[PDB]
Design a protein around this ligand. Structure first.
Ligand code: NA
Ligand code: NA
Lengths: 296, 297
């Protein structure tokens, strides 16, 4: 039974987003989801699809990952990412990486080129250089906008896919939270928290307050509820409902089951998202604002 | 109020040398006694697990702190995590260098930053801001490990869980990682839900074994999922370890305490040093069903 592929993408939990920013975010989200879907509709893998979708958002300055990442307490971008393949649980992740364009791609290089799942900071820096990953200057990742945020504070992106072959996958990438301590790691590179992908269940990517997501293991908690025979929506409502009640943390996630069902749900104010299935594009930011367009 | 309990584990690894066994034995006892010494004072589960793990870090026999296995550059890089079951408060550090006690650094992360996870450079910088002694790195490197890396060139994670006399639980885990690991490789040990989980509403787990496999199956929280579904602790431990072996071909072990004070130590590797203190007795084993149960003064 060859399945109808689906990709879902998110541009991060957010507070209120302005009318103008919404529109730029919309273009970036459509573009990411369009890249992802293209891979899937040419018979690509779920992993290829999630990596592609998230590179798109890393490169795009309107999203807090890669270029457009928030800056740590010291004005520099430090980035976290992870990828996971649902068929064998193979996984790749990186924490505290700097001076590279695409943390998610290196997260894949960890998964594919090493016996390990997770490299960090100085070690992740060395492995990149060794794999032929270029080093780009700091300001290349630093935007003027994120400088104003940092000074104003002082004084996450993801994807899930189901492919033709029935494989599920997730990728997540982030700059983290603004003015963070040097070396702060969030949920993104910690499988079970930043995401989790399993062919016997499905795949999820999360976003929001990184510490809360970790404490509760939101991704695996959503998939627990699914293994229990709750729908993708019900499952999201419980796990998010739990992070809210138990630890007062808010965020969002995206999930696709092995049966093809999907949903974006969030307890933050907004979470830009887009999905693609059966030549149709589903987009939303605020609850109920969802649109559907022909995606030929 | 609840009868307190501390379980400790050394590394879940292959067969152990005859003379190593004695040193290992005494190590378990030291750590379990520390944790139980803390509990018998009415002290917290967080305190006991920290104390137990601290002892194992300081003991050059165990793969954490002094005596950590060596990476590829012949250097010590350490991970640790600790978690408060009360409200799920947690702290963690990874690839940390030239300090005695990663576990204490993670507790500081939990209680003295608004974060739960620091790595490498930032962690060392936080270590400074907290006055943690930056010790000569060569203090942590041992001859057994120096020699062991030369061979691989051409024990495993330690941990503790505890339920205190208020019924709170905690876990703590610390490691030097794996022999000849790549530079800045980070295992399961500082990863919430993999290396360990603690939740007053279910129990506490600390894990050991193939870190990548443990990370892939989210070993610690998995074990808890089963306890939720009604499993006994050993049934749950059997089920999670069982799945790890069948799904990622990984071998490991775990200690668990449930919210009501049911507890077990189980492993799928050949061996796992483990000790438990409860009801005035101390339990200790290395091999499946070799348990000695003796009196604790
Ligand atoms: Na970006
Ligand atoms: Na030690």
């Amino acid at each position: 039974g060859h399945m109808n592929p689906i990709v879902v993408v998110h541009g991060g939990g957010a507070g209120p987003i302005s009318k103008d920013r919404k529109e730029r975010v919309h273009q970036g989200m459509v573009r990411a989801a369009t890249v992802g879907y293209g891979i899937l509709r040419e018979g690509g893998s779920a992993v290829d699809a999630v990596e592609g979708a998230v590179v798109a958002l890393e490169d795009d300055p309107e999203f807090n990952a890669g270029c457009g990442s928030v800056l740590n307490t010291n004005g520099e971008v430090e980035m976290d990412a992870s990828i996971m393949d649902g068929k064998d649980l193979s996984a790749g992740a990186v924490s505290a990486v700097q001076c590279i364009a695409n943390p998610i791609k290196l997260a894949r290089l960890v998964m594919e080129k090493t016996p390990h799942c997770f490299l960090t900071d100085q070690g992740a820096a060395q492995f990149a250089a060794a794999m032929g990953v270029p080093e780009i200057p700091g300001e290349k990742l630093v935007t003027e906008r994120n400088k104003k945020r940092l000074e104003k504070e002082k004084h996450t992106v993801g994807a899930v896919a189901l492919d033709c072959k029935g494989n599920v996958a997730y990728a997540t990438s982030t700059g983290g939270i603004v003015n963070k301590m040097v070396g702060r790691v969030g949920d993104s590179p910690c499988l079970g928290a930043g995401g989790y992908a399993d062919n016997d269940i499905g795949a999820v990517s999360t976003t929001g307050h990184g510490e809360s997501i970790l404490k509760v293991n939101l991704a695996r908690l959503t998939l627990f509820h699914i293994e229990q025979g709750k729908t993708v929506e019900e499952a999201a409502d419980l796990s998010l409902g739990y992070m809210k009640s138990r630890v007062k943390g808010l965020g969002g996630l995206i999930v696709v089951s092995k049966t093809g069902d999907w949903v974006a749900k969030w307890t933050s104010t907004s979470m830009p998202w887009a999905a693609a299935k059966d030549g149709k594009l589903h987009f939303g930011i605020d609850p109920d604002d969802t649109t559907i367009t022909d995606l030929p």
